[PDB]
Amino acid sequence: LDLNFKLLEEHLALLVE
Amino acid sequence: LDLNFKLLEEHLALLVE
Amino acid sequence: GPHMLEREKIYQWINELSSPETRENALLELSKKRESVPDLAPMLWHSFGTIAALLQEIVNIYPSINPPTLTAHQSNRVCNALALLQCVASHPETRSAFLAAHIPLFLYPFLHTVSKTRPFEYLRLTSLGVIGALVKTDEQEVINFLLTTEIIPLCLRIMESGSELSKTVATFILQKILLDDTGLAYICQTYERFSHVAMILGKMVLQLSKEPSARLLKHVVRCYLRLSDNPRAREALRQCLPDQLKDTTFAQVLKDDTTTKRWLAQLVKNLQE
Amino acid sequence: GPHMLEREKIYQWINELSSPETRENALLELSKKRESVPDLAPMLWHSFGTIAALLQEIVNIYPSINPPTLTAHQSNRVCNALALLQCVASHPETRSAFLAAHIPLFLYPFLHTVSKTRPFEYLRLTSLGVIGALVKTDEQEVINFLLTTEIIPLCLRIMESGSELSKTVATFILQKILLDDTGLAYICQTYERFSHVAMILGKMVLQLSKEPSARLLKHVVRCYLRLSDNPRAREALRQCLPDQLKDTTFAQVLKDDTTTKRWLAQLVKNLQE
Amino acid sequence: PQPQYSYHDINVYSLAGLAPHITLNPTIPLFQAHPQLKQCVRQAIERAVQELVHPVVDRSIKIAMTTCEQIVRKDFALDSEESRMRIAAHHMMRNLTAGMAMITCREPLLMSISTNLKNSFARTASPQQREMMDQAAAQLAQDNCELACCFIQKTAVEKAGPEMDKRLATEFELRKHARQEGRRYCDPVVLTYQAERMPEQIRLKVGGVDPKQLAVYEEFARNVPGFLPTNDL
Amino acid sequence: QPQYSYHDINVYSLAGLAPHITLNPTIPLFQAHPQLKQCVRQAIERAVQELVHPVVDRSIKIAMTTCEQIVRKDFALDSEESRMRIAAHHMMRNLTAGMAMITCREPLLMSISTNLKNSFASALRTASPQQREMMDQAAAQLAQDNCELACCFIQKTAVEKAGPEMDKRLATEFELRKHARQEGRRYCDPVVLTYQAERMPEQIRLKVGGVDPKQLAVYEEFARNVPGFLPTNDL
């Protein structure tokens, strides 16, 4: 889950900005 | 109204039978 | 001379239904001709704003119901428009879209009224004729629409406290619904749904001994017969069948109607020990 | 050449989504080529049972929600289908039909959770990411949908509770709704809708003074600014605005955030009278 | 009957919007020689709306929503201008929602106002003293119920807008999407039916909609059930 | 782990729960006051009746629109309304039951435990601080034990009401597939038949005939495994 959790976090970081 | 009231009363009594 | 000279008037009268000024006259003449022209219901449906017009006539009378102020001129105006909406529900071409547009649910408030005045008694009787015309089509799409729209709670109110014709038309609707396999299963899938139907049906039997009606008894007996076709309904009916049936209270009424004896005969035999 | 074998590998995987025996591998292999292939979303929608399969994947984990028994394998599996549903929701060819089937209504159960376990947080974020994808399109249909479905009450829960990332993404979703004029008018229509939002935002301010988050503070300020654009809202905010926004509490943190300093500056100027 | 408050007359921001429009009717069987009990009535009027505004608004939406959509979509099937459809949709929606809201509200509100009034619990008045309290309560229930349901009516209409925009979001697109291709949207099944099986005099005009034909959707905004007419003609 | 099966529970009356109620024999309240064991059947069925009707209506609401659009889209090139009706009902039972379980659990556990606390207090009356904790501990234990039972009851109520009402919303499509039979032709949605032909790859295209079993496996699985219930078969 780790990889998918991390890459998902990076993705959400761009989205909100 | 009475005319249509009478006519409807005849029609309904026929339908139920 | 030909059909056309009258058809052009009918073609117009449909267009006159839009403007609220020219609507009253078009409603009257069109309701007189709803039987002579068979293609009227498609032309009523697919013309612009015509069904929105009839829906508007229904809603504009809602204000008069809750404070009972309906006048006979008002009552005949909606029962005029209701008669064309009935023509749409009678035609096989426009019946599905009639129910898909969920039009009957605006007649449903008319069936909740209790006023008992002639404008309201006529309004209820015309609304009952629309749903009564729908149940007679013997169409599964009419059965599935009525069940889930809570027409049965409305009916059981009329079967309990209304004029004998209102009771007869309503019991006929509850009849046709019960005689459909899916209607019998739906009415008896929940104890509440059966119990509400049983309590009314038993109460009418009580009041049919205080004042007799051969028609109402004929439809009440078939209702008890059709209910007896369900095992769960068979058991409840055997322990709480209204005693007046088997009480020789209705023996005198039966002689004229040989069908009612046959229907009552199989009812008590169906719920045998 | 090699692309034709790749196209057929996807074609078979899509077909393999139907049977539950072959779904897991195809869910994995397609969630990887989501950005690689452009037309995945139209192919996913218009092929047989494929959208139903992903909907099953979602409901299939509903038992693991209450009581919370969500494994890591469950979470990664159901999110890989959520990833494919995000592809459908992103592609313009399929976005409107996707909203027409109210598909996001089935991720709302995931937003109600509070478990804070990594399988639940992954589910919470991936579900939030799907909504954040819709709000970024800035389409009128997206805003008109979310308001009617009551996602705002779902966000406000995640904005008070949950992680900082979850708090940020939820506020961003709320923010994007407020940016639309229709979203503002909806929230400031009643007092229960305003006060519920404003109290959320106030309680978030106190939490940020004790647990600071740069991105959270940015989007919280932007939300307050957008509310200040409404007349009746601007009034209620002059007495409601947290004093920590007015004073020096967030000064050190915002020393290098030019865009946030300007928004806060305008906010106090907006309420000025 | 007759109205009392136009559409814009009542604010539904909060139940305080009720407060100004309540009629006093100062001749009473109780409040005379009792200045203390005039003041129980306002919280009860709001009490009845606050328990009844939410479930009534949701039901009035349900009945009117599916009906308006299929009728507006059918009528405006050949019109390619979505703004004209959006106007007539909300017009008919405002009317059908306010109608079904009034049907579902008044009698429960008539009995919710008076029973909530109670008055005595917040006592030791004689049985004759109880009656003249109940007669004053059942009256004031009839006085302010028109306002009390006009409140729930306006709430449903203000909530009907966003919900209607959701289900016509399909129809609103094919006219925007076809516009991008330099073409006017025309429902292909309606185009075939009106051309092949419909007489001219009732046939749906392809280009747009005529202003004499909009009277139904225009009167849907003029006469709203339960309120004053506005631009009456 | 799902305790019950769809057939095990009867919905006709609220008394369908009483046979399945699991009352832990080691509850300390009943150890000192066994007469209070009789408030449980009532309190549980009170909670299940105050929530069954609001949940059922909401559950079908969220499931209905989704279920009609996916089934119509998927069977738009099939002329056999029999297969579409079967598949549509399969997928409603699965989605409605799911939406019920999410809506039902959290309030039911509170409604059960709270109803138990007042029914317990009404007979005890004395309400000593010990007897209090006895009640909350008993009401908590019983609510947790019988939450799964009462939700499956509301689930099954929704699933049975969901059938007839979907038949209403799918009635239009049912007519077109039998009308075309009356005219000796297959039914094929003009819009879908175009899109598939013009834009869809062959390996994933909607065939103009009926759906192949092995491609209908999704809709069969909607009936094999229903949320909150034991799978009828093992595959």
Coordinates of N, CA and C in Angstrom, one line a residue, chain F residues 38-150:
Chain F
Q38 N -36.8 -9.3 29.5 CA -38.0 -9.3 28.7 C -38.1 -7.9 28.0
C39 N -37.4 -6.9 28.4 CA -37.4 -5.6 27.7 C -36.6 -5.6 26.4
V40 N -35.9 -6.7 26.1 CA -34.9 -6.7 25.0 C -35.7 -6.8 23.6
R41 N -36.5 -7.8 23.5 CA -37.2 -8.0 22.2 C -38.0 -6.8 21.8
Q42 N -38.7 -6.2 22.8 CA -39.4 -4.9 22.5 C -38.4 -3.8 22.1
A43 N -37.4 -3.5 22.9 CA -36.5 -2.4 22.6 C -35.8 -2.5 21.3
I44 N -35.5 -3.8 20.9 CA -34.8 -4.0 19.7 C -35.7 -3.7 18.5
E45 N -37.0 -4.2 18.6 CA -37.9 -4.0 17.5 C -38.4 -2.6 17.4
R46 N -38.4 -1.9 18.6 CA -38.7 -0.4 18.5 C -37.7 0.3 17.6
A47 N -36.4 0.0 17.9 CA -35.4 0.7 17.1 C -35.5 0.3 15.6
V48 N -35.8 -1.0 15.3 CA -35.8 -1.4 13.9 C -37.0 -0.8 13.2
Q49 N -38.1 -0.5 13.9 CA -39.2 0.1 13.2 C -39.2 1.6 13.0
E50 N -38.5 2.3 13.9 CA -38.4 3.7 13.7 C -37.4 4.1 12.6
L51 N -36.6 3.2 12.1 CA -35.6 3.5 11.1 C -35.8 2.7 9.8
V52 N -36.7 1.7 9.8 CA -36.8 0.9 8.6 C -37.4 1.7 7.4
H53 N -38.4 2.5 7.7 CA -39.0 3.2 6.6 C -38.2 4.3 6.1
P54 N -37.6 5.2 6.9 CA -36.7 6.2 6.3 C -35.5 5.7 5.6
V55 N -34.9 4.6 6.1 CA -33.7 4.0 5.5 C -34.1 3.4 4.1
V56 N -35.2 2.6 4.1 CA -35.6 1.9 2.9 C -35.8 2.9 1.7
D57 N -36.5 4.0 2.0 CA -36.7 5.0 0.9 C -35.4 5.7 0.5
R58 N -34.6 6.1 1.4 CA -33.3 6.7 1.0 C -32.4 5.7 0.3
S59 N -32.5 4.4 0.7 CA -31.6 3.4 0.1 C -31.9 3.2 -1.4
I60 N -33.2 3.0 -1.7 CA -33.7 2.9 -3.1 C -33.4 4.1 -3.9
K61 N -33.5 5.3 -3.2 CA -33.2 6.6 -3.9 C -31.8 6.6 -4.5
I62 N -30.8 6.3 -3.6 CA -29.4 6.4 -4.1 C -29.1 5.3 -5.1
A63 N -29.8 4.1 -4.9 CA -29.5 3.0 -5.8 C -30.3 3.0 -7.1
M64 N -31.5 3.6 -7.1 CA -32.3 3.5 -8.3 C -31.7 4.1 -9.5
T65 N -31.4 5.4 -9.5 CA -30.9 6.1 -10.7 C -29.7 5.4 -11.2
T66 N -28.7 5.1 -10.4 CA -27.5 4.4 -10.8 C -27.9 3.1 -11.5
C67 N -28.8 2.3 -10.9 CA -29.1 1.0 -11.4 C -29.8 1.0 -12.7
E68 N -30.6 2.0 -13.0 CA -31.3 2.0 -14.3 C -30.4 2.4 -15.4
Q69 N -29.4 3.3 -15.1 CA -28.6 3.8 -16.2 C -27.6 2.9 -16.7
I70 N -27.0 2.1 -15.7 CA -26.0 1.1 -16.1 C -26.6 -0.1 -16.8
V71 N -27.8 -0.5 -16.4 CA -28.4 -1.7 -17.0 C -28.9 -1.3 -18.4
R72 N -29.6 -0.1 -18.5 CA -30.0 0.3 -19.9 C -28.8 0.4 -20.8
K73 N -27.7 1.1 -20.3 CA -26.5 1.2 -21.2 C -26.0 -0.1 -21.6
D74 N -25.9 -1.1 -20.7 CA -25.3 -2.4 -21.0 C -26.1 -3.3 -21.8
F75 N -27.4 -3.2 -21.8 CA -28.3 -4.1 -22.6 C -29.0 -3.3 -23.7
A76 N -28.4 -2.2 -24.1 CA -29.1 -1.4 -25.2 C -29.0 -2.1 -26.5
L77 N -28.2 -3.2 -26.7 CA -28.2 -3.9 -27.9 C -28.7 -5.3 -27.7
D78 N -29.5 -5.6 -26.7 CA -30.2 -6.9 -26.5 C -31.7 -6.7 -26.6
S79 N -32.3 -7.6 -27.4 CA -33.7 -7.6 -27.6 C -34.5 -8.5 -26.6
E80 N -33.9 -9.2 -25.7 CA -34.5 -10.1 -24.8 C -34.7 -9.3 -23.4
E81 N -35.8 -8.8 -23.2 CA -36.1 -8.1 -21.9 C -36.0 -9.0 -20.8
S82 N -36.1 -10.3 -21.0 CA -36.0 -11.3 -19.9 C -34.6 -11.3 -19.3
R83 N -33.5 -11.2 -20.1 CA -32.2 -11.2 -19.5 C -31.9 -9.9 -18.8
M84 N -32.4 -8.8 -19.4 CA -32.1 -7.5 -18.8 C -32.9 -7.3 -17.5
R85 N -34.1 -7.8 -17.4 CA -34.9 -7.7 -16.2 C -34.2 -8.5 -15.1
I86 N -33.7 -9.7 -15.4 CA -33.0 -10.6 -14.5 C -31.8 -9.9 -14.0
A87 N -31.0 -9.3 -14.9 CA -29.7 -8.7 -14.5 C -29.9 -7.4 -13.7
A88 N -31.0 -6.7 -14.1 CA -31.2 -5.4 -13.4 C -31.7 -5.7 -12.0
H89 N -32.5 -6.7 -11.7 CA -32.9 -7.0 -10.4 C -31.7 -7.5 -9.6
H90 N -30.9 -8.3 -10.2 CA -29.7 -8.8 -9.5 C -28.9 -7.6 -8.9
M91 N -28.7 -6.6 -9.7 CA -27.8 -5.5 -9.4 C -28.4 -4.5 -8.4
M92 N -29.8 -4.4 -8.4 CA -30.4 -3.6 -7.5 C -30.4 -4.2 -6.1
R93 N -30.6 -5.5 -5.9 CA -30.6 -6.1 -4.6 C -29.2 -6.0 -4.0
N94 N -28.1 -6.0 -4.8 CA -26.8 -5.8 -4.2 C -26.5 -4.4 -3.8
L95 N -26.9 -3.4 -4.7 CA -26.6 -2.0 -4.4 C -27.5 -1.4 -3.3
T96 N -28.8 -1.8 -3.4 CA -29.8 -1.3 -2.3 C -29.4 -1.8 -1.0
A97 N -29.1 -3.1 -0.9 CA -28.7 -3.7 0.4 C -27.4 -3.0 0.9
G98 N -26.5 -2.7 0.1 CA -25.3 -2.0 0.5 C -25.6 -0.6 1.0
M99 N -26.4 0.2 0.3 CA -26.8 1.5 0.7 C -27.6 1.5 2.0
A100 N -28.3 0.4 2.2 CA -29.0 0.2 3.5 C -28.0 0.0 4.6
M101 N -27.1 -0.9 4.4 CA -26.2 -1.2 5.5 C -25.3 0.0 6.0
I102 N -24.9 0.8 5.0 CA -24.2 2.0 5.4 C -25.1 3.0 6.2
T103 N -26.3 3.2 5.7 CA -27.3 4.1 6.4 C -27.8 3.5 7.7
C104 N -27.8 2.2 7.9 CA -28.5 1.6 9.0 C -27.7 1.4 10.2
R105 N -26.4 1.0 10.0 CA -25.6 0.5 11.2 C -25.4 1.5 12.3
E106 N -24.8 2.7 12.0 CA -24.5 3.6 13.0 C -25.7 4.1 13.8
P107 N -26.8 4.5 13.2 CA -28.0 4.9 14.0 C -28.7 3.7 14.7
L108 N -28.7 2.5 14.1 CA -29.3 1.4 14.7 C -28.6 1.0 16.0
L109 N -27.3 1.0 16.0 CA -26.6 0.6 17.2 C -26.8 1.6 18.4
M110 N -27.0 2.9 18.0 CA -27.4 3.9 19.0 C -28.9 3.8 19.3
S111 N -29.7 3.5 18.4 CA -31.2 3.4 18.6 C -31.4 2.1 19.5
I112 N -30.7 1.0 19.2 CA -30.9 -0.2 20.0 C -30.5 0.1 21.5
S113 N -29.2 0.5 21.6 CA -28.7 0.7 23.0 C -29.5 1.7 23.8
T114 N -29.9 2.8 23.1 CA -30.7 3.8 23.8 C -32.0 3.3 24.2
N115 N -32.8 2.6 23.3 CA -34.1 2.1 23.7 C -33.9 1.1 24.8
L116 N -32.8 0.3 24.8 CA -32.6 -0.6 25.9 C -32.4 0.1 27.2
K117 N -31.7 1.2 27.2 CA -31.4 1.9 28.4 C -32.7 2.5 29.1
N118 N -33.6 3.0 28.3 CA -34.9 3.5 28.9 C -35.8 2.4 29.3
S119 N -36.0 1.4 28.4 CA -36.8 0.2 28.8 C -36.3 -0.4 30.1
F120 N -34.9 -0.5 30.3 CA -34.4 -1.0 31.5 C -34.7 -0.1 32.7
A121 N -34.5 1.2 32.5 CA -34.7 2.2 33.6 C -36.2 2.2 34.0
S122 N -37.1 2.0 33.1 CA -38.5 2.2 33.4 C -39.0 1.1 34.4
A123 N -38.5 -0.1 34.3 CA -38.8 -1.2 35.2 C -38.0 -1.1 36.5
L124 N -36.7 -0.7 36.4 CA -35.9 -0.7 37.6 C -36.3 0.4 38.5
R125 N -36.6 1.6 38.0 CA -37.1 2.8 38.7 C -36.1 3.3 39.7
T126 N -35.6 2.4 40.6 CA -34.7 2.8 41.7 C -33.5 3.6 41.2
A127 N -32.8 3.0 40.1 CA -31.7 3.7 39.4 C -30.6 4.0 40.4
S128 N -30.0 3.0 41.0 CA -28.8 3.2 41.8 C -27.6 3.3 40.9
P129 N -26.6 4.0 41.3 CA -25.4 4.2 40.4 C -24.8 2.9 39.9
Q130 N -24.9 1.8 40.7 CA -24.5 0.5 40.2 C -25.5 0.1 39.1
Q131 N -26.8 0.0 39.4 CA -27.8 -0.4 38.5 C -27.7 0.4 37.2
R132 N -27.3 1.7 37.3 CA -27.0 2.4 36.1 C -26.0 1.8 35.2
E133 N -24.8 1.6 35.7 CA -23.7 1.0 34.9 C -24.1 -0.4 34.4
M134 N -24.8 -1.2 35.3 CA -25.4 -2.4 34.8 C -26.2 -2.2 33.5
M135 N -27.0 -1.1 33.5 CA -27.8 -0.9 32.3 C -27.1 -0.5 31.1
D136 N -26.2 0.5 31.2 CA -25.4 0.9 30.0 C -24.5 -0.2 29.5
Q137 N -23.9 -1.0 30.5 CA -23.1 -2.1 30.1 C -23.9 -3.2 29.4
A138 N -25.1 -3.4 29.9 CA -26.0 -4.4 29.2 C -26.5 -3.9 27.9
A139 N -26.9 -2.6 27.8 CA -27.4 -2.0 26.6 C -26.4 -2.0 25.5
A140 N -25.1 -1.7 25.9 CA -24.0 -1.7 25.0 C -23.7 -3.1 24.4
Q141 N -23.7 -4.1 25.3 CA -23.4 -5.5 24.9 C -24.5 -6.0 24.0
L142 N -25.8 -5.7 24.3 CA -26.9 -6.2 23.5 C -26.9 -5.6 22.2
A143 N -26.7 -4.3 22.1 CA -26.7 -3.5 20.8 C -25.6 -4.1 19.9
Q144 N -24.4 -4.3 20.4 CA -23.4 -4.9 19.6 C -23.7 -6.3 19.1
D145 N -24.4 -7.0 19.9 CA -24.7 -8.4 19.6 C -25.7 -8.5 18.5
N146 N -26.7 -7.6 18.5 CA -27.9 -7.7 17.6 C -27.9 -6.6 16.6
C147 N -26.8 -5.9 16.4 CA -26.8 -4.9 15.3 C -26.9 -5.6 13.9
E148 N -26.1 -6.6 13.7 CA -26.1 -7.3 12.4 C -27.5 -7.9 12.1
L149 N -28.2 -8.4 13.1 CA -29.5 -9.0 12.9 C -30.5 -8.0 12.3
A150 N -30.5 -6.8 13.0 CA -31.6 -5.8 12.7 C -31.3 -5.1 11.4

